[PDB]
């Protein structure tokens, strides 16, 4: 069914079930045996032209993380100078009656000095420094 997950396919006797995650019209996100892949489905022109396309490399920066917006820090989660893993919440600012929660996108460890509780300073300061 269009835009749905389950996809039942049966060649001869063999039967398989795959899943359809999403796409950007050149790359298809399909699941095979409980694993995500990205298959490219392109015609003759797109195939012959995709060779002549720049492939830039994104910035790989392991450095200090700053608070996007002003606020107040009410709760902290991580400890100064210990291990940090991707997807871990680090602290929570509260602004105009709203607690956000900036986390650690991706890294192994940190070296820094924690901003103490109730420090209504923010203004894009260095709350946690990753080194």
């Amino acid at each position: 069914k269009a835009s749905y997950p389950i996809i039942r396919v049966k060649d001869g006797e063999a039967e398989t079930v795959l899943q359809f995650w999403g796409t950007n019209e050149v790359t298809y996100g399909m699941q095979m045996r409980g694993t995500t892949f990205d298959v490219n489905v392109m015609s003759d022109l797109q195939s012959t032209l995709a060779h002549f396309v720049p492939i830039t490399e994104a910035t790989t920066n392991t450095k200090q993380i700053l608070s996007p917006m002003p606020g107040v820090i009410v709760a902290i989660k991580v400890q100064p100078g210990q291990m940090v893993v991707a997807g871990e919440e680090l602290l929570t600012l509260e602004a105009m009656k709203m607690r956000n929660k900036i986390h650690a996108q991706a890294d192994g460890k940190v070296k820094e000095v924690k901003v103490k509780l109730g420090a209504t300073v923010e203004d894009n300061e260095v709350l946690v420094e990753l080194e």
Binding site: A2, S3, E25, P54
Partner: protein, 489 residues
């Protein structure tokens, strides 16, 4: 045979003809004019005539529906315009004005052609006038694949949507040489007018793509949404999705605490059909979301706040973004669906020093002037003038709905308690703010006054939206006679 394009591809770049071939259907492009020369006769230009004269204009066909397009050529004279280049574009736009067909242009010009004198200015003026006259008649989309400098930048600006390519494109009015000459600062071309700058800082570019191939692939998808002309109806496509699909996950999206945040996409995605959202300006003014989507196989317009970013507070940039989206959607008879969650306007001196009064009025003007069917859903809160601006029932709204835990009040409980009791006995906070929030920060009063049609379970939103949007298919409303409005610029 791959002649004369090896020099181009060696620089990791594509050609105009290749871009045109990628955009349209496999074999449905008919180039209109191909043997035209510049006839300049100045500054040693009497030689080196070119057959195509740096432009490729044709008709093409996308998804079985007609289109018109033109593409600049960087190899020939740097893509400069002339008295002769602009004639082809003018002819294409005039033909696409007679017939109800849109126009899409891939800009690559390096600037004006100096060897023609003021004829380049003449051509620019003609193109500007055609864009001005035909805006609101046929949709216009522009993509910038390479450099775009000088006064040629203005014609993409008048167009409805402008997209940018990441690595090898930029746009600005004046070059960095003049900036160094007058101010004395050394800034590179990318640092001045790169795609990121216009994606985040200036708000001109409506999107950014990583490659030309992806740009074409998604431009086709965007084109699948648009109506063909001003008088043609909104397209409807077949779809296996149905209004009876169960959405009970909406009962739990809103947290029971009033100070916790949530993602509005968790409310947007269930209501619309699967994998049918095309966000517009995703990296600019993130506190508001705008884009296109389909509901039961017909394209609609989506405008919702987001408490994830800055508590979902209206601002200057958000106001401009929403105003432009609403104006375009209404110009071509596209239904509008809005989700409301706003505590007010962003407070700060910089805001008044930047003219919040002008900018915030644009969204209100766009919402009030609109005559397309509107549907509004109030999830959690709506305070002060923000409630009025975001498509309130009094602005000729068709149907308005609220969720059982909503709040519609003049302002927060603290300010109301302060103003209602000047020098009342101390500790008044505890036994007054709670009571006032209990009694008047609830949708019961607004429902008593008649400002919301009904209070609904969050699981019935898809059913209600499909029903209302099906019933409202044939509304005919007209404004008083005017030559045109006077919007607060």
């Amino acid at each position: 045979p791959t002649a004369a394009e090896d020099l181009r591809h060696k620089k990791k770049r594509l050609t105009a003809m290749e871009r045109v071939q990628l955009f349209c259907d496999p074999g449905t492009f008919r180039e209109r004019d191909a043997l035209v020369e510049h006839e300049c006769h100045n500054f040693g230009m009497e030689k080196r005539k070119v057959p195509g004269d740096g432009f490729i204009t044709g008709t093409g066909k996308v998804f079985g529906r007609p289109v018109f397009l033109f593409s600049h050529d960087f190899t020939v004279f740097g893509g400069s315009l002339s008295r002769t280049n602009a004639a082809k574009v003018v002819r294409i736009m005039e033909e696409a004005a007679k017939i109800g067909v849109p126009v899409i242009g891939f800009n690559d010009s390096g600037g004006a052609r100096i060897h023609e004198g003021v004829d380049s200015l003449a051509g620019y003026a003609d193109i500007f006038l055609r864009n001005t006259l035909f805006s609101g008649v046929i949709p216009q989309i522009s993509v910038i694949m390479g450099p775009c400098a000088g006064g040629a930048v203005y014609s993409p600006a008048i167009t409805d949507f402008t997209f940018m390519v990441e690595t090898s494109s930029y746009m600005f009015v004046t070059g960095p040489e003049v900036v160094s000459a007058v101010g004395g600062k050394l800034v590179t071309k990318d640092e001045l007018g790169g795609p990121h700058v216009h994606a985040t800082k200036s708000g001109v570019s409506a999107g950014t793509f990583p490659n030309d191939i992806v740009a074409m692939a998604q431009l086709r998808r965007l084109y699948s949404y648009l109506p063909l002309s001003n008088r043609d109806p909104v397209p409807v496509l077949p779809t296996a999705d149905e209004r009876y699909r169960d959405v009970s996950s909406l009962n739990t999206v809103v947290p029971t605490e009033v100070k916790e945040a949530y993602d509005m996409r968790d409310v947007i995605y269930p209501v619309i059909d699967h994998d049918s959202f095309f966000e517009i300006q995703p990296q600019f003014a993130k506190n508001i979301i705008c884009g296109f989507a389909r509901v039961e196989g017909r394209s609609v317009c989506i405008i919702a706040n987001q408490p994830k970013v800055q508590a979902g507070v209206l601002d200057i940039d958000s106001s401009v973004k929403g105003a432009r989206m609403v104006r375009f959607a209404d110009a071509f008879n596209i239904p509008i669906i809005t989700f409301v969650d706003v505590p007010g306007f962003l407070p700060g001196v910089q805001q008044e020093y930047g003219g919040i009064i002008r900018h915030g009025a644009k969204l209100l003007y766009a919402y009030a002037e609109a005559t397309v069917p509107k549907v509004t859903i109030i999830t959690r809160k709506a305070y002060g003038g923000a409630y009025d601006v975001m498509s309130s029932k009094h602005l000729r709204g068709d149907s308005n709905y609220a969720w059982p835990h909503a709040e519609i009040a003049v302002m927060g409980a603290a300010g109301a308690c302060k103003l209602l009791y000047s020098k009342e006995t101390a500790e008044q906070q505890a036994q007054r703010i709670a009571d006032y929030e209990k009694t008047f920060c609830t949708p019961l009063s607004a429902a008593r006054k008649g400002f919301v049609d009904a209070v609904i379970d969050p699981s019935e939103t898809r059913m209600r939206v499909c029903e209302d949007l099906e019933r409202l298919a044939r509304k005919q409303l007209q404004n008083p006679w005017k030559k045109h409005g006077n919007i607060p610029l």
